[PDB]
Amino acid sequence: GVKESDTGLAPSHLWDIMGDRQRLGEEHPLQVARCTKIIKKYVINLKQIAKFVVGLGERVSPTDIEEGMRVGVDRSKYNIELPLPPRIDPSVTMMTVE
Amino acid sequence: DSRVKAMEVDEKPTETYSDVGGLDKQIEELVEAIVLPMKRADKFKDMGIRAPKG
Ligand SMILES: Nc1ncnc2c1ncn2[C@@H]1O[C@H](COP(=O)(O)OP(=O)(O)OP(=O)(O)O)[C@@H](O)[C@H]1O
């Protein structure tokens, strides 16, 4: 075929059936946001600049949600799903980890 | 801002003034300027003076 190919076209057949199960599941998309204030409830800010007060996901304890932390929220009614590792600057200083 | 909240006190490890070596007259003069107008705030109000600001 050699159109929309980027692999050895042998492990991508099996990968093709695996991606159908991930497309049906909503592990993604998760819109990436960041916390601004924990309210003993959270004050989330989206990147498209519009702020929301959200609840809590059934995936995670509230112990793991911290100040300023990057968090993924639902595509629809915004709810905190998964904590993420911080820092968006890493793209010059990540290049020098030897 | 979220950076202000990270700046708040997370508790700085107990130094105690005994582990600042020497420097006696400096300690005195700081605690005169910062510490007292918080705790002993009634003795400045009766005296009439304003409280040192920094
Ligand atoms: N008078 C002192 N008694 C005991 N330890 C001291 C004394 N002065 C300095 N030290 C030791 O030196 C270390 C470094 O001091 P410090 O970082 O305060 O320097 P500085 O005067 O703040 O320098 P800068 O010009 O960068 O502000 C301290 O952690 C402390 O252990």
Residue A49 is encoded by which pair of tokens?
């600049």
Identify the residue whose C-alpha is closest to ligand 1 atom 28: B20
Tell me how far apart the alpha carbons of residues A80 and A32 are, in angstroms, rounded to a whole number: 10
Bridge partners of A73? Answer: A31, A80
Asked if the C-beta of B2 comes within 8 angstroms of chain A's C-beta atoms, the answer is yes
Cβ atoms of A3 and A9 within 8 Å: the answer is: no
Residue with tokens 């582990």: B19
DSSP A37: E
Entry resolution (Å): 4.1
Distance from CA of A26 to the nearest CA of B (A): 29
The torsion angles phi and psi of A45, rounded to 5 degrees, stand at -120, 125
B21 CB near ligand 1 (under 6 Å): yes
How far, in Å, are A21, B12, B19, B29, B36 from residue B22 at the CA level?
A: 70, 21, 9, 14, 22
Farthest CA pair distance, chain B: 40
How far, in Å, are A41, A48, A49, A95 from residue A56 at the CA level?
A: 7, 21, 21, 35
Asked if the C-beta of A37 comes within 8 angstroms of chain B's C-beta atoms, the answer is yes
Pairing of strands A51-54, A70-73: unpaired
Cβ atoms of A42 and A54 within 8 Å: the answer is: yes
Distance from CA of A6 to the nearest CA of B (A): 42
Tell me how far apart the alpha carbons of residues A43 and A73 are, in angstroms, rounded to a whole number: 12
Considering only CA atoms, give the Rg of chain A: 18
Set of chain A residues whose Cβ sits within 8 Å of the Cβ of B6: 67-68
Residue whose C-alpha is closest to residue A67's, from B5, B25, B36, B22 = B5
